[PDB]
Ligand binder design. Structure first.
Ligand SMILES: CC(=O)SCCNC(=O)CCNC(=O)[C@H](O)C(C)(C)COP(=O)(O)OP(=O)(O)OC[C@H]1O[C@@H](n2cnc3c(N)ncnc32)[C@H](O)[C@@H]1OP(=O)(O)O
Ligand SMILES: CC(=O)SCCNC(=O)CCNC(=O)[C@H](O)C(C)(C)COP(=O)(O)OP(=O)(O)OC[C@H]1O[C@@H](n2cnc3c(N)ncnc32)[C@H](O)[C@@H]1OP(=O)(O)O
Ligand SMILES: *C(=O)CCCC[C@@H]1SC[C@@H]2NC(=O)N[C@@H]21
Ligand SMILES: *C(=O)CCCC[C@@H]1SC[C@@H]2NC(=O)N[C@@H]21
Lengths: 541, 210, 541, 56
């Protein structure tokens, strides 16, 4: 029927209060700084390397992505801040690679482009990490991969951190062999010079495109056969497009230049015989009833000052409609049912510390969502897990483990958004990075550590006073200042959003307006895989 | 004689093309199962950055590059040579004709939009302008060796002969068929390497020219 | 998106060249002869038996088929040339039976009609073979069978060739018992006189229609009970419609005359609760850009003169669009992706002899098509398998076995079209009759043998010179002429298209224009069964 | 076949024998070096096990 009226969330804030104005100014400053940093990352390796890249007749890699995807279609780029201030004097913009979810020939694909302007396409350790994260996104969501290979091989003085381990360079080819065994298409466009580790990327792909007189594939290049076997060969007749396309048979399609390679790639994606079938129910999409710079006014940048998570849900969901679940029992967790772009979402949001009743409310909700096949969105703003004595007497760590066990075992698409702090085992109760969410974005005011600075300094000082009390002497003000300096400094440095996305601990720092769009994009990509039945473990009652 | 298009007219041609591509996107979506979904809106919304599309339109004989920035509010900022235009608009239908509704720097206009193969037609009350879309090379592009180990049937040429391209040079029968060697080359046959009746071998030279 | 432009195949031929004019005249002569032969086959047993058939008030069997199928609907008739000059002085038109795929009540069915004007509906051995081929088409493609039984029992002096073996008359009832165990409906309309082997056809069917005072079912007729038990009975009260419809219960529906039986059959097909569900992707159909009498000009009738198979693909596929796969590696095999009537087709066509690289290209392509669930169309024009010494040194028979093993194991719908010669183990590499294609049509210029004749005569002569060289004497010109006469004569006689479709070695000789339509019809029938996952054997690398 | 055994100087595998390449391509080859056990077991890779004689 769906004609009967309901109520909506959200209230209009006081635009003149000094709290709102200060919060708006702080979050506007953070978002402007985020914008200028990513505009510097957008250039890549500087204008010298871009000039020498277009002097050989190639496109720049973002031009390749713009010409590959559908015209006017959005592009969800993942981990734009990988490698940011990570290596000591080396600048690696974007990680040295560009990964994203786009729309090619009406199919949502994962696109992995070697940005060859930075370090000649060398593979730093964060490059391997960011590429492996893109590949596990594409295997989880069942998205075809398009690799735009312009590589340079594995860096040498970091070779340990690139070569042998489980989640090191060789995993890449493992992920190609397994995805193609599940009918997840791999397409490689060779636009560069694949030297001996990159050379396995087109040879492990179902269909190749290589560019005339520009793309080269060899298991051992000219200086490599020089140092290994002692031989001089020219590169374009050692591994050029003519040899591979006509004699050896490594390549399947042959392109004149980069525009022809991208046109052929769109043809290849169209001949994949793929049709997206949905299993959730869809309703007409509707925009909310409130703007999204109000989120700048509401959230701010002060993590010591709490707010209400219902104001955020009011500004990201369809029509600001929200069916709340158990609204009075355990009210530091907000659970409910909403819709984003017509998709049904179960939302779990933090509003305080986690008590025992909040964790039981969350476990009931996650079982409900897995029984009905409804995707989950976690909105992390955590400070703790209620330390105390009357709390451990009840079973608080008996109740947060049920929350952890239900979030781990859940087989629906889960997406996390960290809108505030995220500390301790609370981070595990609300689907942190270890619990395999499909995506995990953060806002520019977030913090993530094990216990925040003050607490770690206090615990270390009190345990070393206890420890030294086998003999026992104090250095009171000296120990205080000399432990409260380098621990607060370290925890505030490593809790930053740029510190955590300089690694690949999340999928991006996003602007609080763009939030709604980004969730919709992620949720539609996450619906390419059919939702499987959930089996839970043993709930410890 | 034909007159050059104004930069505002190139903005209208670029906008009509972009909106036509959107129309194709919309009619694909209407046939999709995944309806109402994002990606269907041709908004060009990149994350944290803007998207600029570089297209080239051919005005008569000369090419003009137009850099189209997709704005968050649905407008376009089109920079043609150096000058930036604020370009907004949409399509609407009246009967069986499609019209392009434009607003360029606050100046509203209306023209009929017809796109036939490569040519963009804009019919207005001040004239008619034809802008062409360039065609990329890969859509407009369309000595000898013995193929199999077979016996030679007939040799057509001698040492010292002058032939043309697409001319019968040697014939060989291989197993079940008949494959004539013909010349792509130019020049003079100095050498008939195989006598008549001999057995040539795959990927081998039959005739050499100096 | 699907809006971006692509290129198409094909070039317009020289209509004035003597090659084109001679080829057009030869293939026009072959097609006119095919038309007049099938118009003579259309009459059946002559005008005497047709007059005595309509004097008893029955329809002719092609009239029955025209009144059974949907009005204006096409009819794909299978094996119109069965029994053509096969028995020495007996003429058996059409095999004595009419099989075809038609459209009844909006469902595509297999129709098997006993043509009772020829030999009183007797079952010759080619009649059993043609009927069993129709039944295995209907079991493979999951099509309901409608038998229009007007039989006469199994011929007597050919009784060995009809009775005991595995693929002899009794298999018919096996195929009814298994198809009906898979929910593939059997419907039998008894319009004739089923004598003791035909009597099991309506009794093994789920629903019967028998005609008042015309259809009779008995396990032993009046002369049969005379010779077996010694009894005189009248036939219409031994096994007529009234006894079976009212007392014994063999029949389920009772018809007044043939029009009532066909109307009731359309009702019965409508109550089958069948709904056709597609699993491939469909696009808007589009006609090609070139005519189809150009195929007469291009192919001709000279099998020693080669042509290009891309000219054929240009004239049978949607819009003449074709995405070629590995176009420069192994260029005597043309593989690619096209569309026929909106269905995705992977096409494999011969352009020369099979080398090793061509067979590897084909194996890669067939694995690609089975991974994506794309149907296959093989276009056979074969002469061999590259005999040589440097070829056996590489592993040519190591590489054609991979092609054979991939074509055999493939579980997508495969359709073969023989447009030229088809000799040797090359015939097995390109999905011959033994490799279970759904359908296999031929053009009127085709040839199929184990070799080409000259080769067989030469091998036999050189082998007998070697054999006699234990003592050794020659009969040079005598042996030459006396082995080159009766071997070239035999191989050219048995390689004919009419020789091969006089047996049931294929599903029809078709006109090269009609090709496109016939493929579309076959492909839509082949999509009634859901495509299953392919398991391959061991690829010998 | 998944696994082969071919016998030294006795078993021969070829897609076109000596009179067949004679009548098809016009070539004279010896049979034991066109398709013998040594070529297939050491170069082409058609055979997997190599036997001395029938008991082996
Ligand atoms: C470890 C392995 O897996 S084997 C790797 C084999 N090494 C290579 O093939 C890389 C060397 N060659 C090249 O990079 C080829 O010239 C190309 C085509 C890939 C790059 O083209 P060019 O731009 O001409 O290469 P160029 O010499 O300019 O390299 C640019 C930078 O990349 C560096 N580089 C490239 N590959 C590597 C690598 N594997 N390790 C360390 N540095 C590398 C170069 O030292 C150079 O120095 P820079 O960091 O100061 O800029
Ligand atoms: C015993 C067995 O299971 S094997 C044979 C089946 N058993 C029989 O009853 C054989 C006798 N024939 C019959 O079955 C029936 O009586 C029928 C169908 C022939 C009766 O058909 P009618 O409409 O009366 O036509 P008629 O009987 O004249 O048959 C026409 C011709 O076909 C031949 N014929 C028909 N059925 C058979 C048969 N089963 N075996 C051999 N010849 C047959 C007849 O010899 C006759 O010869 P002709 O063509 O040289 O004139
Ligand atoms: C900052 O996050 C405040 C202190 C952290 C709370 C501590 S850390 C480890 C314990 N686990 C938990 O959920 N809370 C406790
Ligand atoms: C006519 O078809 C020419 C000669 C046949 C080639 C021979 S026949 C048996 C061998 N197998 C094969 O594929 N080619 C060889």
């Amino acid at each position: 029927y769906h004609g009967d009226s309901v109520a909506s969330l959200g209230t209009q804030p006081d635009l003149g209060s000094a709290l709102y104005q200060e919060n708006y100014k702080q979050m506007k400053a953070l978002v402007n700084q985020l914008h200028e940093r990513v505009e510097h990352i957008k250039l890549g390796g500087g204008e010298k390397a871009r000039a020498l890249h277009i002097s050989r007749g190639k496109l720049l890699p973002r031009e390749r992505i713009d010409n590959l995807i559908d015209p006017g279609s959005p592009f969800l780029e993942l981990s734009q801040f990988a490698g940011y201030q990570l290596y000591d004097n080396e600048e690696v913009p974007g990680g040295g690679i560009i990964t994203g979810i786009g729309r090619v020939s009406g199919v949502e694909c994962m696109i992995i482009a070697n940005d060859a302007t930075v370090k000649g396409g060398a593979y730093y350790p964060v490059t391997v990490k960011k590429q492996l994260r893109a590949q596990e996104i594409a295997m989880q969501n069942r998205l075809p991969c398009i690799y735009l290979v312009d590589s340079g091989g594995a860096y040498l003085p970091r070779q340990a951190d690139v070569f042998p381990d489980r989640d090191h360079f060789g995993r890449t080819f493992y992920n190609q062999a397994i995805m193609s065994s599940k009918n997840i298409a791999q397409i490689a466009v060779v636009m560069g010079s694949c030297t001996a580790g990159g050379a396995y990327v087109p040879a492990m792909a179902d269909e190749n495109i290589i560019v005339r007189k520009q793309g080269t594939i060899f298991l051992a290049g000219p200086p490599l056969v020089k140092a290994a076997t002692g031989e001089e060969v020219s590169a374009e007749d050692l591994g050029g497009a003519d040899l591979h396309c006509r004699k050896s048979g490594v390549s399947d399609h042959w392109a004149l230049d980069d525009h022809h390679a991208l046109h052929l790639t769109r043809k290849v994606v169209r001949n994949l015989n793929y049709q997206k079938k949905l299993d959730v129910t869809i309703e007409p999409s509707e925009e909310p009833l409130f703007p999204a710079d109000e989120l700048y006014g509401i959230v701010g940048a002060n993590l010591k000052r709490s707010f209400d998570v219902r104001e955020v849900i009011a500004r990201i969901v369809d029509g600001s409609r929200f069916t709340e679940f158990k609204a009075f029992y355990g009210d530091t967790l907000v659970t409910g049912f909403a819709r984003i772009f017509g998709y049904p979402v179960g939302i779990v949001g933090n509003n305080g510390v986690l008590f025992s009743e909040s964790a039981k409310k969350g476990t009931h909700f996650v079982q409900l969502c897995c029984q009905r096949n409804i995707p989950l969105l976690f909105l992390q703003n955590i400070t703790g897990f209620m330390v105390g004595r009357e709390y451990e007497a009840e079973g608080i760590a008996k109740d947060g483990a049920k929350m952890v066990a239900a979030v781990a075992c859940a087989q629906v698409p889960k997406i996390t958004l960290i809108i505030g702090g995220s500390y301790g085992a609370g981070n595990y109760g609300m689907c942190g990075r270890a619990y395999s969410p499909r995506f995990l974005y953060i806002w520019p005011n977030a913090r993530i550590s094990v216990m925040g600075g003050e607490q770690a300094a206090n615990v270390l000082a009190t345990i070393t006073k206890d420890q030294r009390a086998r003999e026992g002497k104090q250095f009171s003000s000296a120990d205080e200042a000399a432990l409260k300096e380098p621990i607060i400094k370290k925890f505030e440095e490593e809790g930053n959003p740029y510190y955590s996305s300089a690694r690949v601990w999340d999928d991006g720092i996003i602007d609080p307006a763009d939030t709604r769009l980004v969730l919709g994009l992620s949720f539609s990509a996450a619906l390419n895989a059919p939702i499987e039945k959930t089996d839970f473990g043993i709930f410890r009652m | 004689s034909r007159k050059a298009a104004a930069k505002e007219s190139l903005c209208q041609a670029a906008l009509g093309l972009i909106l036509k591509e959107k129309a194709m996107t919309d009619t694909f979506t209407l046939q999709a199962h995944d309806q109402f979904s994002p990606f269907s809106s041709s908004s060009g919304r990149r994350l944290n950055i803007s998207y600029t599309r570089n297209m080239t339109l051919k005005d008569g004989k000369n090419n003009v590059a137009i850099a189209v920035t997709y704005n968050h509010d649905g407008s376009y900022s089109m920079q043609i040579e150096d000058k930036t235009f604020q370009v907004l608009g949409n399509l609407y239908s009246e009967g069986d004709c499609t019209y392009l509704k434009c607003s360029v720097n606050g100046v509203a206009s209306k023209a009929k939009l017809i796109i036939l193969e490569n040519t963009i037609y804009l019919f207005s009350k001040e004239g008619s302008i034809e802008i062409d879309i360039p065609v990329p090379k890969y859509l407009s592009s369309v000595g000898p060796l013995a193929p199999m180990t077979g016996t030679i049937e007939k040799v057509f040429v001698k040492a010292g002969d002058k032939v043309k391209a697409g001319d019968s040079l040697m014939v060989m029968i291989a197993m079940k068929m008949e494959h004539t060697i013909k010349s792509p080359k130019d020049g003079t046959v100095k050498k008939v390497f195989y006598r008549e009746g001999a057995q040539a071998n795959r990927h081998t030279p039959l005739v050499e020219f100096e």
